PDB file of C-alpha atoms and ligand atoms in Angstrom:
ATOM      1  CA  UNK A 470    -178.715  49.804 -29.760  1.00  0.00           C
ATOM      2  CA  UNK A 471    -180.963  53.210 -29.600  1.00  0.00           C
ATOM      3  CA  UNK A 472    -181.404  55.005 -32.684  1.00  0.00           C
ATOM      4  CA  UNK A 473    -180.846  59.000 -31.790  1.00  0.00           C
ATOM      5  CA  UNK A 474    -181.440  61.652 -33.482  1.00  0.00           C
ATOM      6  CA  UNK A 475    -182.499  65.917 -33.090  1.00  0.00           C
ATOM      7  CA  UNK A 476    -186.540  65.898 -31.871  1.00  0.00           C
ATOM      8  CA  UNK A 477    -189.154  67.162 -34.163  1.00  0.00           C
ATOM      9  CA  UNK A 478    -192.660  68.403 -33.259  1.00  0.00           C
ATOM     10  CA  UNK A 479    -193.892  64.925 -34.404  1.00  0.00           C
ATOM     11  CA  UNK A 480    -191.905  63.298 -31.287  1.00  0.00           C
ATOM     12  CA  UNK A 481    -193.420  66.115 -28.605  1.00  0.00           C
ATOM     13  CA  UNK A 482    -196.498  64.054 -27.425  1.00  0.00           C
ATOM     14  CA  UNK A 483    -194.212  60.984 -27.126  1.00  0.00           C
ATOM     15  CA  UNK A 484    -191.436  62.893 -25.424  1.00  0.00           C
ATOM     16  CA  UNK A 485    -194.063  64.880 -23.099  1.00  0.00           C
ATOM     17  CA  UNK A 486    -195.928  61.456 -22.111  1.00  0.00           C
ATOM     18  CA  UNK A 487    -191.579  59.765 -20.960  1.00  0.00           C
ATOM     19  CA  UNK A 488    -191.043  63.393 -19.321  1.00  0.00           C
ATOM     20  CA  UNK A 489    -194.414  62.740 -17.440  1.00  0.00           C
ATOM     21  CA  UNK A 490    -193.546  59.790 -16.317  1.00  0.00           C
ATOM     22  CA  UNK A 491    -189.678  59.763 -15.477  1.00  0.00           C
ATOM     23  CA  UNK A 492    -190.898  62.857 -12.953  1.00  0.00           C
ATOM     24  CA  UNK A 493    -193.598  61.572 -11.109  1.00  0.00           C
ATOM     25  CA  UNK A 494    -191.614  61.509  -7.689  1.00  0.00           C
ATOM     26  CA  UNK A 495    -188.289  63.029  -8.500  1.00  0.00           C
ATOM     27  CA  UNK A 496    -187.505  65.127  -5.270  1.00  0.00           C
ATOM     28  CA  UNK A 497    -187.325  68.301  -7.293  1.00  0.00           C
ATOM     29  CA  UNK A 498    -190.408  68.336  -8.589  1.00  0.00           C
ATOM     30  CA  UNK A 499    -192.166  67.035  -5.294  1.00  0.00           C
ATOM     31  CA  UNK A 500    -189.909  69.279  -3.440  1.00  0.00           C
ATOM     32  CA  UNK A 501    -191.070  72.459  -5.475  1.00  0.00           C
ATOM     33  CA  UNK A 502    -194.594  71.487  -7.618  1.00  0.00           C
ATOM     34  CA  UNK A 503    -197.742  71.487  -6.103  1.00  0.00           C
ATOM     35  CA  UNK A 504    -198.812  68.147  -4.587  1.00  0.00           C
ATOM     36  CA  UNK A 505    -202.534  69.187  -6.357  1.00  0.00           C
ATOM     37  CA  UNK A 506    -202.616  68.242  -9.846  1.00  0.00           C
ATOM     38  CA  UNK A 507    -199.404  67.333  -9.383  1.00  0.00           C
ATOM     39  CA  UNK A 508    -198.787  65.022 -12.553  1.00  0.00           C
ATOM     40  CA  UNK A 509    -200.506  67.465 -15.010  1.00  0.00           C
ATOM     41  CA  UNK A 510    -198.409  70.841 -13.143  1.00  0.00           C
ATOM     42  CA  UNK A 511    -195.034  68.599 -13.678  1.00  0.00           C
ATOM     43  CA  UNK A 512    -196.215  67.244 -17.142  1.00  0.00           C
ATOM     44  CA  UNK A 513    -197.006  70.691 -18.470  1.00  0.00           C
ATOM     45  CA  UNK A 514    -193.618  71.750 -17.230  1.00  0.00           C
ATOM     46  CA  UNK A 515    -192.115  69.549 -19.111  1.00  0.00           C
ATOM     47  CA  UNK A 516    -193.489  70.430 -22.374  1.00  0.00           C
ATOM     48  CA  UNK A 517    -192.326  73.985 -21.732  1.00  0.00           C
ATOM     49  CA  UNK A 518    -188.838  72.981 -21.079  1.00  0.00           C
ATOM     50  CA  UNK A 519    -189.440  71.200 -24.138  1.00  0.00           C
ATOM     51  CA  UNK A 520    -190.854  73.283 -26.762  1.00  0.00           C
ATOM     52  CA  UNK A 521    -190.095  76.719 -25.359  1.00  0.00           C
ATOM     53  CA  UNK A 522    -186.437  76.176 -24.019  1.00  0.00           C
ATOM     54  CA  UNK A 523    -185.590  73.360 -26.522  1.00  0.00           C
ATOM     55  CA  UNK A 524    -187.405  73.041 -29.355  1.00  0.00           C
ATOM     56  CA  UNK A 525    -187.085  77.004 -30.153  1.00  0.00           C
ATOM     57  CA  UNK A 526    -183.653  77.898 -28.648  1.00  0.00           C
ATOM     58  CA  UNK A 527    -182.012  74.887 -27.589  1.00  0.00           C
ATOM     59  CA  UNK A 528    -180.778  71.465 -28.985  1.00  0.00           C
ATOM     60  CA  UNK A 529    -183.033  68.201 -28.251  1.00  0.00           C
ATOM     61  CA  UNK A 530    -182.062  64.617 -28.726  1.00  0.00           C
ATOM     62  CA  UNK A 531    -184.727  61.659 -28.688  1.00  0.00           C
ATOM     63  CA  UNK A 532    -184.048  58.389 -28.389  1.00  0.00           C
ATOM     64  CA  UNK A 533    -186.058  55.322 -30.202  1.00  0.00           C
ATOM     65  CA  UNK A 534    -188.534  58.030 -30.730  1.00  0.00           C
ATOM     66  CA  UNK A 535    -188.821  59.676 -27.543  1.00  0.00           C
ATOM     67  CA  UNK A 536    -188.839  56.522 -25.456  1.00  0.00           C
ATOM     68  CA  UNK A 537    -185.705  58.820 -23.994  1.00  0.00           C
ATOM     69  CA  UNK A 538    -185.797  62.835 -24.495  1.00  0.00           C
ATOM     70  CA  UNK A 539    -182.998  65.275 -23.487  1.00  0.00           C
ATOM     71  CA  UNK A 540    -183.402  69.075 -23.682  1.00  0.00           C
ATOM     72  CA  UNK A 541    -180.571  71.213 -24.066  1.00  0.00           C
ATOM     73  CA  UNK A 542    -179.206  74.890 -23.701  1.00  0.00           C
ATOM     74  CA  UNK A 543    -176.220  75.836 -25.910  1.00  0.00           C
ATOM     75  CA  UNK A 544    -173.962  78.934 -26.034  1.00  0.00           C
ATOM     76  CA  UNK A 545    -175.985  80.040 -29.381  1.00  0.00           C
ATOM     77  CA  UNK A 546    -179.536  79.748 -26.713  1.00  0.00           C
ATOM     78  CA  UNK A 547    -178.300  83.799 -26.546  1.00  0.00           C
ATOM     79  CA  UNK A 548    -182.370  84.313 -25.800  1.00  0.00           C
ATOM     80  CA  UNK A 549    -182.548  82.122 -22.863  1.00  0.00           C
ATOM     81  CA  UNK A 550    -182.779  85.061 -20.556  1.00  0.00           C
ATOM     82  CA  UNK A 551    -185.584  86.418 -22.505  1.00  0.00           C
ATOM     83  CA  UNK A 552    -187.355  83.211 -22.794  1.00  0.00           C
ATOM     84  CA  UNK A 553    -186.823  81.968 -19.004  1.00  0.00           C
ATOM     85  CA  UNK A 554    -188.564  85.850 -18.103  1.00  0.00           C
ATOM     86  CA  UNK A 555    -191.640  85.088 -20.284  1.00  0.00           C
ATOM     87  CA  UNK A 556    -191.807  81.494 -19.252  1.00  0.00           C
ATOM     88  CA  UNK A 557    -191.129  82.312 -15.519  1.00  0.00           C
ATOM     89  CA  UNK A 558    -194.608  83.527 -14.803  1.00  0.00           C
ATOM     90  CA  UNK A 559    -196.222  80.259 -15.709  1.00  0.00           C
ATOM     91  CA  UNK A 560    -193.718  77.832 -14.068  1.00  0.00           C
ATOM     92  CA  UNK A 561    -194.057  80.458 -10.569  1.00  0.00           C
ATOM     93  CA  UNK A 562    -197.953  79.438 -11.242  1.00  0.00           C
ATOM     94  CA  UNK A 563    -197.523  75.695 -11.852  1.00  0.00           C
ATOM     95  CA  UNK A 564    -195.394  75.548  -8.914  1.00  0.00           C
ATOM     96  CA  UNK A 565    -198.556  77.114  -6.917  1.00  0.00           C
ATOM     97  CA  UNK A 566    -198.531  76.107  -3.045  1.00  0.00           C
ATOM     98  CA  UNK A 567    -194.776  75.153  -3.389  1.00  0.00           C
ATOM     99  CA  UNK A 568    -193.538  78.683  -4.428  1.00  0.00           C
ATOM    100  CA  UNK A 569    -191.183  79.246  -1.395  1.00  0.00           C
ATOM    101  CA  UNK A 570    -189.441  75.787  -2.311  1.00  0.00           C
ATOM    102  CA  UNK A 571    -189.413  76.723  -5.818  1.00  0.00           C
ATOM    103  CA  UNK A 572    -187.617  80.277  -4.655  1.00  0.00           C
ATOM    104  CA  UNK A 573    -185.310  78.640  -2.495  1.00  0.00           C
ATOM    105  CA  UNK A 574    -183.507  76.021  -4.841  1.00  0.00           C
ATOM    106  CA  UNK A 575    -183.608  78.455  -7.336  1.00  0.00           C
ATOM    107  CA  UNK A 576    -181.880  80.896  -5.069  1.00  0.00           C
ATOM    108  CA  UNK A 577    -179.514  78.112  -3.882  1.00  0.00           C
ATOM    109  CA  UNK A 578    -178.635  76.753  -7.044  1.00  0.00           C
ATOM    110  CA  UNK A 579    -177.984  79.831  -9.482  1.00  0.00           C
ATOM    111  CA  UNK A 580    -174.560  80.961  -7.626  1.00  0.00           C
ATOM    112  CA  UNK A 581    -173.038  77.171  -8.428  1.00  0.00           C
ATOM    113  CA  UNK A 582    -174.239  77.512 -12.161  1.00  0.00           C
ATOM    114  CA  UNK A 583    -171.561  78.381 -15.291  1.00  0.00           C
ATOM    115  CA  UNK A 584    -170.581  82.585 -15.318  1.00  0.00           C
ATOM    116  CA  UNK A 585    -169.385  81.144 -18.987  1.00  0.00           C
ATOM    117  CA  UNK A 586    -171.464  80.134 -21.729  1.00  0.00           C
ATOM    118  CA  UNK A 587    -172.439  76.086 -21.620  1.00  0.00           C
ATOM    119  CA  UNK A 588    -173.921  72.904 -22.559  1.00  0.00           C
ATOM    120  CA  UNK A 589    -176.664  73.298 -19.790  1.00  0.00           C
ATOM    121  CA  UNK A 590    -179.039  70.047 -19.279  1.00  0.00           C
ATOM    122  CA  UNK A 591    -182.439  71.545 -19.385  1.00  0.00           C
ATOM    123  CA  UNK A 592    -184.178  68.212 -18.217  1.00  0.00           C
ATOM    124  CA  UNK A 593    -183.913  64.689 -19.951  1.00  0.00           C
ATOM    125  CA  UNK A 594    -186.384  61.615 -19.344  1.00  0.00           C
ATOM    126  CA  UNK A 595    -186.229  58.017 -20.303  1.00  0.00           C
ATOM    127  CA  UNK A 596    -189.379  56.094 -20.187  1.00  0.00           C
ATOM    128  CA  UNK A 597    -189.474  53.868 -16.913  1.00  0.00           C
ATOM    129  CA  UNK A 598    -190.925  50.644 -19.603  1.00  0.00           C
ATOM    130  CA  UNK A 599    -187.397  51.293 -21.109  1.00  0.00           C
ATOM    131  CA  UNK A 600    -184.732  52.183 -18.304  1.00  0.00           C
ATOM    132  CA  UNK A 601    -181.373  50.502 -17.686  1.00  0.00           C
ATOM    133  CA  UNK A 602    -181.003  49.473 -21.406  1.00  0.00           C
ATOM    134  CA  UNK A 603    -178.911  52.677 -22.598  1.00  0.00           C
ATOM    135  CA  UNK A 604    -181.538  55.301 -23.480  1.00  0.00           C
ATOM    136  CA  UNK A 605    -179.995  57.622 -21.221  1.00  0.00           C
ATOM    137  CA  UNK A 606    -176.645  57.254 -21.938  1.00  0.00           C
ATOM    138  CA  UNK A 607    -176.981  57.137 -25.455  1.00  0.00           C
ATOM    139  CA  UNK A 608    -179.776  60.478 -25.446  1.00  0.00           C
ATOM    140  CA  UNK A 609    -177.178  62.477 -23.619  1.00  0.00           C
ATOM    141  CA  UNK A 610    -174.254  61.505 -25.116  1.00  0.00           C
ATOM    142  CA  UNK A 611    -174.578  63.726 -28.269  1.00  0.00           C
ATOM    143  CA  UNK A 612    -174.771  66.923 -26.299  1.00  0.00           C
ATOM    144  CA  UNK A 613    -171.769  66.421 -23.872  1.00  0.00           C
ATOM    145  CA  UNK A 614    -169.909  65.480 -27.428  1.00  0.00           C
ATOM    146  CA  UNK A 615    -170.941  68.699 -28.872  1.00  0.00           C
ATOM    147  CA  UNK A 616    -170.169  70.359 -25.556  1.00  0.00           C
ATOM    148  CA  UNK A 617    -166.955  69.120 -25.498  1.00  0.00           C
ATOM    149  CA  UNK A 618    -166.267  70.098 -29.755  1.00  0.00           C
ATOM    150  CA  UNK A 619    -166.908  73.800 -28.780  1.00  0.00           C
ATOM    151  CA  UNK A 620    -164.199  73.964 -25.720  1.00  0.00           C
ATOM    152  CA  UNK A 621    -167.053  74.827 -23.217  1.00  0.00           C
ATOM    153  CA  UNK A 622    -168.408  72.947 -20.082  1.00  0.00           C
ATOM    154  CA  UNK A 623    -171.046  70.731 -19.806  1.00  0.00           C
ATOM    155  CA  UNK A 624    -173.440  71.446 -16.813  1.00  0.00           C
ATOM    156  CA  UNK A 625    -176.471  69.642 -15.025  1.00  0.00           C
ATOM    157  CA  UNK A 626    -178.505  69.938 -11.880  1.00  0.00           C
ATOM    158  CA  UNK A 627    -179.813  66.537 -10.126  1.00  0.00           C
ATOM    159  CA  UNK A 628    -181.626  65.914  -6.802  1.00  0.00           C
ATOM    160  CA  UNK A 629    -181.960  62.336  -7.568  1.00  0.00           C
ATOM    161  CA  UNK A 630    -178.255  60.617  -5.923  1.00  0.00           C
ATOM    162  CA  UNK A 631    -178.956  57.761  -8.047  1.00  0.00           C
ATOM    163  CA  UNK A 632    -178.141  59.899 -11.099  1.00  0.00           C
ATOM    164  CA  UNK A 633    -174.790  60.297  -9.770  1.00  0.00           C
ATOM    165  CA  UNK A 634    -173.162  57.293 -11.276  1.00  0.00           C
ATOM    166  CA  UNK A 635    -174.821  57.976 -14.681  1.00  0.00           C
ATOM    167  CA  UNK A 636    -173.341  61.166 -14.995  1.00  0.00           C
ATOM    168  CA  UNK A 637    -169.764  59.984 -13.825  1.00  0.00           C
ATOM    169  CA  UNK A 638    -169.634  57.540 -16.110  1.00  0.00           C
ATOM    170  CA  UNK A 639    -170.054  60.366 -19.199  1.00  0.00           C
ATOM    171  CA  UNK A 640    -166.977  61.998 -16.914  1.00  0.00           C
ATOM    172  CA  UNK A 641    -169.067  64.983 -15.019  1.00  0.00           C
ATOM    173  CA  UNK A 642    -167.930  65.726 -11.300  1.00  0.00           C
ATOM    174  CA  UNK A 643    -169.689  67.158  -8.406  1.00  0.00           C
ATOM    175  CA  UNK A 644    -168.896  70.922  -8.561  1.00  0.00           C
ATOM    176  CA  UNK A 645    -171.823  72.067  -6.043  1.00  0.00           C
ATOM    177  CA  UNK A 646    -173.413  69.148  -3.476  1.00  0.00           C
ATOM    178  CA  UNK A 647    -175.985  71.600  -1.715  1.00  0.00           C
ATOM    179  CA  UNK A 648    -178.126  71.363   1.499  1.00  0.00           C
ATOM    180  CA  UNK A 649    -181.499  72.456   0.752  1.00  0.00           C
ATOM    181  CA  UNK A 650    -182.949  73.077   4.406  1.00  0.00           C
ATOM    182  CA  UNK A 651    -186.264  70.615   4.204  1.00  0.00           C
ATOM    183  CA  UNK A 652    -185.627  69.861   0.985  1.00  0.00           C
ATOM    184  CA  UNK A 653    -183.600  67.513  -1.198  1.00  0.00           C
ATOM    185  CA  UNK A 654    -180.274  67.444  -1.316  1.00  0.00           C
ATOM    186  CA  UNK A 655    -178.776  68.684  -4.918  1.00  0.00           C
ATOM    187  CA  UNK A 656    -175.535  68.163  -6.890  1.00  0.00           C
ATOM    188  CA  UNK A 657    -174.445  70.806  -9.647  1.00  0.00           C
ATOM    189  CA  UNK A 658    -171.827  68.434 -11.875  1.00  0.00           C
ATOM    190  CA  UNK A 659    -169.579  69.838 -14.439  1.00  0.00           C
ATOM    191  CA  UNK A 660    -168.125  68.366 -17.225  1.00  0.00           C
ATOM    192  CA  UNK A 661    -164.852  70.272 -18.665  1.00  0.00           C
ATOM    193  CA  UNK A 662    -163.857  69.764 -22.407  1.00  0.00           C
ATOM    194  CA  UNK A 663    -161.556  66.287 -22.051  1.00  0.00           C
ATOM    195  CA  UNK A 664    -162.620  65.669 -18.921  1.00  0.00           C
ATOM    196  CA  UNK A 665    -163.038  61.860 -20.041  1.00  0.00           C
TER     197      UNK A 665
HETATM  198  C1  LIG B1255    -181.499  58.836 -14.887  1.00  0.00           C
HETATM  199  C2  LIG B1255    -181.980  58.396 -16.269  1.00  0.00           C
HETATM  200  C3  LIG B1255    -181.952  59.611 -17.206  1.00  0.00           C
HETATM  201  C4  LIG B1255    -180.977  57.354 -16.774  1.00  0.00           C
HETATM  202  O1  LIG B1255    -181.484  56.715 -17.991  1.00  0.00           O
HETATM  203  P1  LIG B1255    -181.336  55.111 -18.208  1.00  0.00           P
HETATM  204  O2  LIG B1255    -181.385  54.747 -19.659  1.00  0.00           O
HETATM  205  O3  LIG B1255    -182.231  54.381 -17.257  1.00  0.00           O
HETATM  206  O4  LIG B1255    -179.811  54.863 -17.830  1.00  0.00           O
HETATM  207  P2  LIG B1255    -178.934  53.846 -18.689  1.00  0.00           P
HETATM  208  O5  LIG B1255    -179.741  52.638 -19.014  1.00  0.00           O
HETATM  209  O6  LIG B1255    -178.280  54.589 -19.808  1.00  0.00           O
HETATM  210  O7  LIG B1255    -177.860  53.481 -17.529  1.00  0.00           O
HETATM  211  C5  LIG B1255    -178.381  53.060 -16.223  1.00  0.00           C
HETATM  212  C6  LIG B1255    -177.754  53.854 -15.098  1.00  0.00           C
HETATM  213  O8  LIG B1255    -178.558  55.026 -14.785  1.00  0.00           O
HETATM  214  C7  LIG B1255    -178.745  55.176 -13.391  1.00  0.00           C
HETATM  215  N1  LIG B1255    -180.196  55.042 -13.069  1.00  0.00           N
HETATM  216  C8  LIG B1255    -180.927  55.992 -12.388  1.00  0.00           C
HETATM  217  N2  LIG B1255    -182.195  55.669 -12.270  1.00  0.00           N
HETATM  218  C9  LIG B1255    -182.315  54.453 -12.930  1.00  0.00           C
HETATM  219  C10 LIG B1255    -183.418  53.604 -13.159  1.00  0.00           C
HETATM  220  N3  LIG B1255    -184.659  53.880 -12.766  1.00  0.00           N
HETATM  221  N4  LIG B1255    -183.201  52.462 -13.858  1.00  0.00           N
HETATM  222  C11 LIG B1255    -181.954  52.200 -14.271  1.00  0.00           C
HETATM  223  N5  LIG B1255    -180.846  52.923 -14.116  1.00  0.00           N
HETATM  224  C12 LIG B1255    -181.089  54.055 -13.430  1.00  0.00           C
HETATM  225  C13 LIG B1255    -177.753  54.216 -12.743  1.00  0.00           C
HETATM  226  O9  LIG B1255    -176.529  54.904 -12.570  1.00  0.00           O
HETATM  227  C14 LIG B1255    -177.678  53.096 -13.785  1.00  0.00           C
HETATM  228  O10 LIG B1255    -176.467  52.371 -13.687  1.00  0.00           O
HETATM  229  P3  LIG B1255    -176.712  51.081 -12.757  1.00  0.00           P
HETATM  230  O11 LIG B1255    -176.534  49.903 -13.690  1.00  0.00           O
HETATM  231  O12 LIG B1255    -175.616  51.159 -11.711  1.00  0.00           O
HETATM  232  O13 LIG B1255    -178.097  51.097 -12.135  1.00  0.00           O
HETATM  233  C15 LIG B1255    -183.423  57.812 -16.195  1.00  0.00           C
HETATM  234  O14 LIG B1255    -183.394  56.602 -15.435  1.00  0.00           O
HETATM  235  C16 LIG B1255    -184.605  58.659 -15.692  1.00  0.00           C
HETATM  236  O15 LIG B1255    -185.208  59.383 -16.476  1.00  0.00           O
HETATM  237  N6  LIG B1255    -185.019  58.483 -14.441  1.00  0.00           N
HETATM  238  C17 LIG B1255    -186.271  59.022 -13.918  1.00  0.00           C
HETATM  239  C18 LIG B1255    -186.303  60.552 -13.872  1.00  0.00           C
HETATM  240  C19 LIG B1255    -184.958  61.212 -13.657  1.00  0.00           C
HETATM  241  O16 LIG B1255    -184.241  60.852 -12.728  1.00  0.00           O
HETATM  242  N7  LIG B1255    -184.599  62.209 -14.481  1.00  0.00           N
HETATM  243  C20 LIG B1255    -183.253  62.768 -14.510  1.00  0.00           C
HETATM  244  C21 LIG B1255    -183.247  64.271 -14.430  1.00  0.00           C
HETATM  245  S1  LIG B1255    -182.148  64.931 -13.148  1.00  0.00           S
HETATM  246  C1  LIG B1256    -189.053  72.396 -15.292  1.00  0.00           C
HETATM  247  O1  LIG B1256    -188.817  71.775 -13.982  1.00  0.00           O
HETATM  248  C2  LIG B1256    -187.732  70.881 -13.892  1.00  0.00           C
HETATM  249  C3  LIG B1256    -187.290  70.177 -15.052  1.00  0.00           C
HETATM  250  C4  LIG B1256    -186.197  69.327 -14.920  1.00  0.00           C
HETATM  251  C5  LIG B1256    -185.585  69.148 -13.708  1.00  0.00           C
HETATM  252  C6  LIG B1256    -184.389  68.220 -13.683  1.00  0.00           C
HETATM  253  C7  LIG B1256    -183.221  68.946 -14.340  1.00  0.00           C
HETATM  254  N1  LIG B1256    -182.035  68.143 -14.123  1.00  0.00           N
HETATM  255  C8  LIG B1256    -181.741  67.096 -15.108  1.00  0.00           C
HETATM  256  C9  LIG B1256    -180.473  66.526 -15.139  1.00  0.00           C
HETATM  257  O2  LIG B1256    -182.595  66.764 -15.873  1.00  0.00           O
HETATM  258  C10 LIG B1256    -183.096  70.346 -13.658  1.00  0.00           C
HETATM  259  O3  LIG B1256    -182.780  70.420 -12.509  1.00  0.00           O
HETATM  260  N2  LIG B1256    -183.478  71.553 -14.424  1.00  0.00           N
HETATM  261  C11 LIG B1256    -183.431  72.926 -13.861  1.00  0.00           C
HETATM  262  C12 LIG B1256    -182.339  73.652 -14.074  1.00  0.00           C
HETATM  263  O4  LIG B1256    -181.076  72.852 -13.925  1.00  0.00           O
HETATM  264  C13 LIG B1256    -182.507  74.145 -15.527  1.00  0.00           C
HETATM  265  N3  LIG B1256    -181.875  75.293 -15.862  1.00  0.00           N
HETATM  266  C14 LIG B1256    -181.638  76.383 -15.143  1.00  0.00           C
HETATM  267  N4  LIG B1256    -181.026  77.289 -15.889  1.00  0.00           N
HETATM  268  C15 LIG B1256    -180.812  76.767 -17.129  1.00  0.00           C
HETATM  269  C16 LIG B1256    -180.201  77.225 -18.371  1.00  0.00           C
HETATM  270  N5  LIG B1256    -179.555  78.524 -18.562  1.00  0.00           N
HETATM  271  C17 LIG B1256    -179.155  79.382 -17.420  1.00  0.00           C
HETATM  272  C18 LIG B1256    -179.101  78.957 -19.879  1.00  0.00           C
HETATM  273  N6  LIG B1256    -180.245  76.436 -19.403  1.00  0.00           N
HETATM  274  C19 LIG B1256    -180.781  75.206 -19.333  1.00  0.00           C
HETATM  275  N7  LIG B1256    -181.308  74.723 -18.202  1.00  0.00           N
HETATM  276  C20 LIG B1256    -181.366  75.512 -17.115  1.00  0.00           C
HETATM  277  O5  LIG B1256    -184.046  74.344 -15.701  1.00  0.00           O
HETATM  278  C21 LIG B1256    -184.624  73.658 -14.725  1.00  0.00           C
HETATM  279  C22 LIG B1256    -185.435  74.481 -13.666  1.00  0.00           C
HETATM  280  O6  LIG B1256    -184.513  75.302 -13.070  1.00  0.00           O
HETATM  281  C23 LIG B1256    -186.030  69.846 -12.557  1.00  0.00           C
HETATM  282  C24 LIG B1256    -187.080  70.700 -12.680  1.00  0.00           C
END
């Protein structure tokens, strides 16, 4: 069974290195990340989602030490906005080349996202050594519990359709499935308090 618990800064090179690694050809990320450099552009943002977005105004789990890693907005993450406009700059640069894709699921996607306040899934990773033994279930788990203790919804993005099941199982549905013209296809999923 994986021990989880709240990351601390001694887990970020760890949790960085199964980020890294769970993204190197997820569709979003090839979709809207420069193909140059395109491990260190995705790795880098990864450890902003991580340290900027979680680790200051968010909740993080790790699991077995980072071996899984999931990154968190909550309704107390009241500076998001503020953080997201200083951060945006750098992720519109990482993104270089792939800008216009970047625009476009962004533009897309933010209509089908909570008007409420919500558990919102920043990104989570489990280290491909360590996949299908429960790291993911287990590293997400705590956050859709907490979700689900302060009567608000539970939200994620995914453009990988093997996710799908995953997130079922922790009782999320399908809320947005979206065409992205030339790009991959994306599902906004929602998880109500009670929903399972
Ligand atoms: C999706 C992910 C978070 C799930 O973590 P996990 O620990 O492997 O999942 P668990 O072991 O808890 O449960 C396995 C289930 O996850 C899903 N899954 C997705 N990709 C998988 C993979 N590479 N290996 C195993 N299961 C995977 C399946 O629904 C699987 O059930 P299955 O038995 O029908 O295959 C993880 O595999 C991952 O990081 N993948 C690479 C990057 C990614 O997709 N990030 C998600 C952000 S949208
Ligand atoms: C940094 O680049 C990434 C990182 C991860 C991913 C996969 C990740 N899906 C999973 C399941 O892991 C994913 O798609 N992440 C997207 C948004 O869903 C997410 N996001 C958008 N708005 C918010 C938000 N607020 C509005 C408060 N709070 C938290 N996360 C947010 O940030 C990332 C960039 O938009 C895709 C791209």
């Amino acid at each position: 069974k994986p021990t989880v618990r709240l990351a601390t800064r001694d887990d970020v090179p760890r949790a960085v290195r199964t980020l890294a690694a769970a993204f190197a050809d997820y569709p979003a990320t090839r979709h809207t990340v420069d193909p140059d450099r395109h491990i260190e552009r995705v790795t880098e943002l990864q450890e902003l989602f991580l340290t900027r977005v979680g680790l200051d105004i968010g909740k993080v789990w790790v699991a077995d030490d980072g071996a899984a890693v999931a990154v968190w907005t909550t309704p107390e993450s009241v500076e998001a906005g503020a953080v997201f406009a200083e951060i945006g700059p750098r992720m519109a640069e990482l993104s270089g080349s792939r800008l216009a894709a970047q625009q476009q699921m962004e533009g897309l996607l933010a209509p089908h996202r909570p008007k409420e306040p919500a558990w919102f899934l920043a990104t989570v990773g489990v280290s491909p050594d360590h996949q299908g033994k429960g790291l993911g279930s287990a590293v997400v788990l705590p956050g859709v519990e907490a979700a689900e203790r302060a009567g608000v919804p539970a939200f994620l993005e995914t453009s990988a359709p093997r996710n799908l099941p995953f997130y079922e199982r922790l009782g999320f549905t399908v809320t947005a499935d979206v065409e992205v013209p030339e790009g991959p296809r994306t599902w906004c999923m929602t998880r109500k308090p009670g929903a399972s």
